[PDB]
Amino acid sequence: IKKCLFPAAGYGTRFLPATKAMPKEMLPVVNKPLIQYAVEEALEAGLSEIGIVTGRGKRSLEDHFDISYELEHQIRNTDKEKYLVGIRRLIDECTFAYTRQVEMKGLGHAILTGRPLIGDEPFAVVLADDLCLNLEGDSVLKQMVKLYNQFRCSIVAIQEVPPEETNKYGVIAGEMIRDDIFRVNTMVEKPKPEEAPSNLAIIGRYILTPDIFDLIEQTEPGKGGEIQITDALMKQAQDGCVLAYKFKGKRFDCGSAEGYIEATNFCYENLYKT
Amino acid sequence: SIKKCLFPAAGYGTRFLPATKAMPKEMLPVVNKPLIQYAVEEALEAGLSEIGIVTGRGKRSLEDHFDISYELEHQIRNTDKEKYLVGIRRLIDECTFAYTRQVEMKGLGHAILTGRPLIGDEPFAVVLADDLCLNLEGDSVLKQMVKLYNQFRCSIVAIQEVPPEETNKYGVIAGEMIRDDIFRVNTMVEKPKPEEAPSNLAIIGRYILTPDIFDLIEQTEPGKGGEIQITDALMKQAQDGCVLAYKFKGKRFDCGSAEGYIEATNFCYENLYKT
Amino acid sequence: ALVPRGSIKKCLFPAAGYGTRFLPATKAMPKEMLPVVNKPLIQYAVEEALEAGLSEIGIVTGRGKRSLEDHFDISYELEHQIRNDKEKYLVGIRRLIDECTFAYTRQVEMKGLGHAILTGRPLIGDEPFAVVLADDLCLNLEGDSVLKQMVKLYNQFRCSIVAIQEVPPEETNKYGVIAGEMIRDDIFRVNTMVEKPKPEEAPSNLAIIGRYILTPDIFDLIEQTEPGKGGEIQITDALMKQAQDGCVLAYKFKGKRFDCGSAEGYIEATNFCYENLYKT
Amino acid sequence: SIKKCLFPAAGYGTRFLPATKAMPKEMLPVVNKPLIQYAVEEALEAGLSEIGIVTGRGKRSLEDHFDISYELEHQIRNTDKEKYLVGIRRLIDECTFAYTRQVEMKGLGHAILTGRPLIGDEPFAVVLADDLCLNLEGDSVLKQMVKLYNQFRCSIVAIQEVPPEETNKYGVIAGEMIRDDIFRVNTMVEKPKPEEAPSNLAIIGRYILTPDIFDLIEQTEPGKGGEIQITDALMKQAQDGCVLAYKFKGKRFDCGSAEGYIEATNFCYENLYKT
Ligand SMILES: O=c1ccn([C@@H]2O[C@H](COP(=O)(O)OP(=O)(O)O[C@H]3O[C@H](CO)[C@@H](O)[C@H](O)[C@H]3O)[C@@H](O)[C@H]2O)c(=O)[nH]1
Ligand SMILES: O=c1ccn([C@@H]2O[C@H](COP(=O)(O)OP(=O)(O)O[C@H]3O[C@H](CO)[C@@H](O)[C@H](O)[C@H]3O)[C@@H](O)[C@H]2O)c(=O)[nH]1
Ligand SMILES: O=c1ccn([C@@H]2O[C@H](COP(=O)(O)OP(=O)(O)O[C@H]3O[C@H](CO)[C@@H](O)[C@H](O)[C@H]3O)[C@@H](O)[C@H]2O)c(=O)[nH]1
Ligand SMILES: O=c1ccn([C@@H]2O[C@H](COP(=O)(O)OP(=O)(O)O[C@H]3O[C@H](CO)[C@@H](O)[C@H](O)[C@H]3O)[C@@H](O)[C@H]2O)c(=O)[nH]1
Ligand SMILES: [Mg+2]
Ligand SMILES: [Mg+2]
Ligand SMILES: [Mg+2]
Ligand SMILES: [Mg+2]
């Protein structure tokens, strides 16, 4: 597995007007765009062929991941060995392919939109609005890539949440295979806490097998009138293998205002000042 | 009446890379509002509806944010979430935006001289958006300074009392006191070693300038760091013209620095976005 | 109530038109960027302004506003791909970037050429200024550029100047037409101006070509102008007001003009510049 | 079967400076339609709806041309949404465009290898948009070649008979003749000296390639002008595989040269614009 897909064509509503001309995934956490954390995360797991589904402010994605000749000459007097090491590696070690999602019909349609970039290969999906950090060990995506070579199924990252906060996520339920691994049998997107079948909510880290594409084409609109992955993975869990995995590490919900501030404050004390 | 405001936004922003690789430091958002948007709403509150932006590395993010977005109108179509956009929309309908490039980074003074085609022979305000200035209790810092200009009709410089140890990070002025908050600038030095700054009154990024400053910038030689400093050009004006330093009403976060940027983020989330 | 008639230093370029005649190509590019063989229409125009001594260029941008900006800004990528010398081609554009200052402002809604010129008011101020419509490709290889001729005439008589040329009476509905007293063979004092009149109602056969010298009171006159032909605000109608209680001169310029706002003139200009300029 | 088409558009295009400064040579307009739009309509006509563009110096104008324009729609309200827009809306309606950047201009072969993430392990067509090919009497050149591929399932290269004096401008092929217009290639040379030109038959910018060409390009050393030539890579394929040359039916204009660009403009003006 060497491919990673990044959906970045949402409405990004909780951060207007800042997200007017840049996607929610480009917001900087102190000094690093959300999506740059995620791309560095995928390279750690060996996924060096990056594919980005773009929408409004698509141009902020591209310009960030180009060889900037303006920036190149402005910083002639180095000190890029102090600030650009991370972004430069990405440009020299990764390939970036971009494709446009014309109409916002949900995450599932966004994942289906990137099919020509993936083909008949297993691929990872990273939702950058979920900032995942594991400074102690390997990042969440590497945890899931190592898990794929062993089980060779779809893997979805999850973590327990409060039951009142359950209608904000997709939630899975199933029998346990290991200390932190589950056989999924049911998946619902943003259910009513009364109908919440579990307290095990997905973060947006997914490892998908190419047969998911033909399943998304069979998925009908669900929560919010959008085509949810969650429903496409559900169909895959019945006739196939889909594992839920409680990752090791810290996650911030940077799709929310509150979570973004937590991430900004966290990364300043533990990442910037150092 | 003073009606133009200039925004230098062609800095290196070396402290906020890589995020500033393709967007200027002045476009960083506190919670969900770019720094420069606060400043333009500040300028419009003072009656300055003719905005001119001097652009540099990430020129497209400045233009794209203050441009009408026909895509945005289609995605948030039919009233929908205008609750997040009223501020920016008002700017687009009531303000005019003009852009000009600074291709060589030679200092804040040179950047202001670069905006001369956008200004001409009339007084204008200069705003450094990396200084987030807020006055919840009343008029904005720029509105305060515009009212002072209509009165004295000379160049006005925003200042604030600063600890003596941090005097090497700002421009410092000194002069005789005309009022508890207004000083007639005698002396101006950029970033002074702390037992050489003539006072502990530091310049904040808000100016009102008279057109004669342009020809004074052309006579200014490179100073601190080899850059052309508006502080040095403003010194020449003090000698045989009027320059007033004003201790403004309000709070200023140093969002040009990483620590001040977070102070502003946390403050605005608790008092403004959560509201 | 005092009109400044001082030295001219600024030139304004309206480039926010819909450009429907070349619509596929202009989807993301202004009609004024269509290359005549290898040089964009507007580059010809800005070189015209530099020859006249006007190094302060303001561009009113629209749909493909980004094609304009990228062509006149310092492209660091372009310099990297050479810096070793195929700058025979880049002599003209590098000159413009080194000797001119460019400022841009957007026209939000298309209400006409007059509204477009008013849109550039923040770039101009209370100054006399020239206006160039880049879809009118003007060449004078045996002498001065059209705008250079017009600047010389302004410096002497200090009025608003409108470049004109005689055209057949049947094509009069494509242009604005003037009529007035003839001071000398190539100079007229304008009395009346109508935009795209029907051939029966045309004041003369003297058609306005996109080269203007304007005094800054035209701005206040554009704001008083009511929508005209097609519901747009025409500069012709504001200049009509100025011609009444002021001085507006029509100038029969020397040189060849191509109508590159029409497909036919675009093809004609392409072949002319290819044979007489490109293999040279 | 085959559904993908690749468009290299990251050349230097210096013959068209300064017009190409911020736009690729493949975006130049022929009277009113960009050169690369003709080519994509050609690819759609052949059933190739998955478009991949390898971009470079003017990569922005490309993206913009094939992306949805909310501004252009708002500016029209169902009016001239026929006119010249008919062709380009169908393209955005029926195709999927993916873009990847060519960081280093090392040749046409390197440009095709750069697009490997967009193609994968499946056959694809390559189109050089500077070759304007028009066949008003039937199928498009690419359509002809896709039909030929469905039978032989080799790599197919479009060729054209040219005078021996022009062989240093093209890649030239030589091989045993299968039919009056189909040849089994065993030799391929890029821009040979007319004296050593192996034949009269010159390569036009239309290809059908099998995915093993990718690994062939990585093994290819710098050729003509020190650049990586697909001609040299296709040579390797012809020796250890099957490569067919096809005298296509239709008229081709060399819009990579100024003279041929004028020819295309005049031709398309008389025969297509009025129509
Ligand atoms: O049409 C669309 C909609 C969304 N996105 C992107 O998809 C991601 C997630 O979209 P978002 O609006 O944040 O959805 P959520 O409310 O977060 O829900 C999703 O993300 C959760 C984890 O963050 C999962 O638990 C849920 O199952 C999943 O539905 C973001 O990158 C969006 O930009 C697109 O690219 N296209
Ligand atoms: O060539 C340049 C350099 C800077 N800038 C911009 O202008 C401002 C410069 O500020 P900065 O680079 O942070 O310098 P400072 O340390 O801010 O110093 C200036 O701003 C302080 C207010 O914050 C004052 O105290 C000082 O007198 C004054 O020199 C920023 O918005 C830059 O983006 C330009 O546009 N062009
Ligand atoms: O709302 C608008 C309309 C036009 N333009 C620009 O201004 C010029 C207008 O040209 P065009 O649309 O071709 O107008 P014309 O029909 O050619 O008419 C103008 O040009 C003729 C000379 O070329 C004159 O005779 C007319 O009086 C004058 O109105 C072009 O550069 C446009 O891009 C704008 O910027 N904004
Ligand atoms: O590093 C590069 C070089 C070129 N190109 C593109 O490749 C195409 C062809 O480049 P060009 O320089 O025009 O090549 P030619 O000299 O025309 O030669 C090519 O096209 C000829 C016919 O047009 C063939 O006969 C040759 O074999 C083939 O190499 C154009 O789209 C270029 O932009 C790239 O994308 N990257
Ligand atoms: Mg989310
Ligand atoms: Mg500062
Ligand atoms: Mg015209
Ligand atoms: Mg070629």
Q: What tokens does C144 get?
A: 């001065």
D18–C90 CB contact, under 8 Å: yes
Q: Residue D27 and residue C40: Cα distance in Å, rounded?
A: 13
CA distances from A151 to A125, A183, A211, A234 (A): 17, 11, 16, 18
Instruction: Enter the resolution in angstroms.
Output: 2.9
Q: Residue D171 and residue D200: Cα distance in Å, rounded?
A: 10
Buried b / exposed e along C47-57 (16+ C-beta atoms within 10 A): bbbbebebbbb
- Residue C191 within a domain: yes
Q: What tokens does D168 get?
A: 């240093």
Question: Using a 6 Å cutoff on CB, does residue D188 contact ligand 4?
Answer: no
- Taking CA A164 as the corner, what is the angle to CA A163 and CA A166, rounded to the nearest 5 degrees? 65
- Taking CA B39 as the corner, what is the angle to CA B37 and CA B43, rounded to the nearest 5 degrees? 115
Q: Residue C185 and residue A268: Cα distance in Å, rounded?
A: 76
- Residue C233 within a domain: yes
Q: What tokens does D49 get?
A: 């709806």
A64–B269 CB contact, under 8 Å: no
* Polymer length in residues for chain D: 275
Burial class from Cβ neighbours inside 10 Å (0-12, 13-18, 19+) for residue A198 reads buried
Of B50, B98, B122, Cβ closest to residue C103: B98
Chain A residues inside the 8 Å CB shell of C79? 69
- Residue C195 within a domain: yes
Whole-number Å distance, alpha carbon D47 to ligand 4 midpoint, is 24
Helix (H, G, I), strand (E, B) or coil at D43: helix
Q: Of B221, B220, B223, B159, give the one whose Cα is nearest residue B191.
A: B223
Q: What tokens does D174 get?
A: 């030589």
Structure solved via? X-ray
* Polymer length in residues for chain A: 274
| CATH number of residue D26's parent domain | 3.90.550.10
Q: Residue C82 and residue C89: Cα distance in Å, rounded?
A: 12
Contacts of C243 (CB under 8 A, 6+ apart): C180, C190, C191, C192, C193
- Please compute Rg for chain D using Cα positions: 18
Please provide residue A156's backbone torsions phi and psi, each rounded to the nearest 5 degrees: -125, 135
Nearest C-alpha in B relative to D72: B70
Evaluate whether B175 touches B185 at the Cβ level (below 8 Å).
yes
- Residue in the block written with tokens 């290969």: A121
The residue nearest atom 33 of ligand 2, judged by CA position, is B11
The DSSP-derived string for chain B is ---EEEEEE----TTSTTGGGSS-GGGPEETTEEHHHHHHHHHHHTT--EEEEEE-TTHHHHHHHHS--HHHHHHT-SSTTGGGTHHHHHHHHH-EEEEEE--S---HHHHHHHTHHHH-SS-EEEE-TTEEEE-TTSS-HHHHHHHHHHHH-SEEEEEEE--GGGGGGSEEEEEEEEETTEEEEEEEEES--TTS-SSSEEEEEEEEE-THHHHHHHTPPP-GGG---HHHHHHHHHHHS-EEEEE-SSEEEETTSHHHHHHHHHHHIIIII--
Q: Of D234, D175, D188, D235, give the one whose Cα is nearest residue D210.
A: D234
- Residue C5 within a domain: no
Q: Residue A247 and residue A132: Cα distance in Å, rounded?
A: 10
C104–B98 CB contact, under 8 Å: yes
Q: By residue range, what is the domain housing residue D229? A: 4-273
Q: Residue D122 and residue D108: Cα distance in Å, rounded?
A: 20
State the total domains in chain C: 1
- Please compute Rg for chain A using Cα positions: 18
**Chain C contact for D136, CB < 8 A?**
no
N-to-C CA span, chain A: 34
B98–C105 CB contact, under 8 Å: yes
Evaluate whether D62 touches D27 at the Cβ level (below 8 Å).
yes
Nearest C-alpha in A relative to D98: A99
CB-side neighbour CA atoms (13 Å) of C171: 11
Burial class from Cβ neighbours inside 10 Å (0-12, 13-18, 19+) for residue B28 reads buried
Q: What tokens does B157 get?
A: 């410089």
D32–C21 CB contact, under 8 Å: yes
Evaluate whether C253 touches C138 at the Cβ level (below 8 Å).
yes
Of C26, C78, C274, Cβ closest to residue D21: C78
Q: Residue A96 and residue D208: Cα distance in Å, rounded?
A: 25
**Chain B contact for C101, CB < 8 A?**
yes
Beta strands B50-55; B4-9: pairing state: parallel
Q: Residue D100 and residue D59: Cα distance in Å, rounded?
A: 9
Beta strands D131-134; A250-253: pairing state: unpaired
Q: Residue C133 and residue C234: Cα distance in Å, rounded?
A: 13
Evaluate whether A72 touches A26 at the Cβ level (below 8 Å).
no
Q: What tokens does C15 get?
A: 């480039």
Contacts of B270 (CB under 8 A, 6+ apart): none
CA distance A139 to chain D (A): 25
Q: Residue A66 and residue B21: Cα distance in Å, rounded?
A: 10
**Best residue for ligand 2 mutational test, from B54, B108, B203, B235 (most atoms within 8 Å of Cβ):** B108
Cis peptide before B18 (omega within 30 of 0): yes
Evaluate whether A4 touches A42 at the Cβ level (below 8 Å).
yes
Interrupted after residues, chain A (C–N over 2.5 Å): none
**Chain D contact for A98, CB < 8 A?**
yes
User: Within 10 A of D94 (CB to CB), how many other CB atoms are there?
Assistant: 9
C105–B121 CB contact, under 8 Å: no
Q: What tokens does C157 get?
A: 């008589």
**Chain C contact for A76, CB < 8 A?**
no
Evaluate whether D247 touches D145 at the Cβ level (below 8 Å).
no
Evaluate whether A5 touches A126 at the Cβ level (below 8 Å).
yes
The DSSP-derived string for chain C is ---------EEEEEE----GGGHHHHTTS-GGG-EETTEEHHHHHHHHHHHTT--EEEEEE-TTHHHHHHHHS--HHHHHT-----TTTTHHHHHHHHH-EEEEEE-SS---HHHHHHHTHHHH-SS-EEEE-TTEEEE-TTS--HHHHHHHHHHHH-SEEEEEEE--GGGGGGSEEEEEEEEETTEEEEEEEEES--GGG-S-SEEEEEEEEE-THHHHHHHTPPP-GGG---HHHHHHHHHHHS-EEEEE-SSEEEETTSHHHHHHHHHHHIIIII--
Burial class from Cβ neighbours inside 10 Å (0-12, 13-18, 19+) for residue C207 reads buried
Evaluate whether D173 touches D201 at the Cβ level (below 8 Å).
yes
* Consecutive H or E run containing A237: helix A229-239
Question: Using a 6 Å cutoff on CB, does residue A9 contact ligand 1?
Answer: yes
Q: What tokens does C187 get?
A: 């100079």
